[PDB]
Write a protein that binds this ligand. Sequence first.
Ligand code: 2SW
Length: 93
Amino acid sequence: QIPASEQETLVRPKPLLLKLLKSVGAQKDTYTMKEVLFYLGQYIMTKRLYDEKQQHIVYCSNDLLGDLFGVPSFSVKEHRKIYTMIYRNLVVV
Ligand SMILES: CC[C@@H](CS(=O)(=O)C(C)(C)C)N1C(=O)[C@@](C)(CC(=O)O)C[C@H](c2cccc(Cl)c2)[C@H]1c1ccc(Cl)cc1
């Protein structure tokens, strides 16, 4: 459904997203989506907003991530929706 070439595209996170990304990776002016997805994913795991015990759902209503995505929770398996939420927070280069 989602082509792998999409992970090579270049983007610039908006201020709030950049704040989240910097807690897990070095600050950069331009990121590849592969980088954005990893840092976002790593932020979710280190903060345990995703417990492998709780059937694929990430709970973020008590986190900045919830403010970024505009939702209290979401499934890690519904990738199309994740991309749409992430793009609301970045600008394509
Ligand atoms: C928070 C969970 C992270 C950890 S992880 O792999 O990124 C890693 C362990 C490498 C940090 N994560 C996953 O667990 C995965 C394996 C969940 C799944 O599809 O079964 C993949 C997921 C992912 C990867 C690429 C693109 C999308 Cl939209 C989602 C990806 C993910 C990345 C960002 C967001 Cl916002 C949501 C889910």
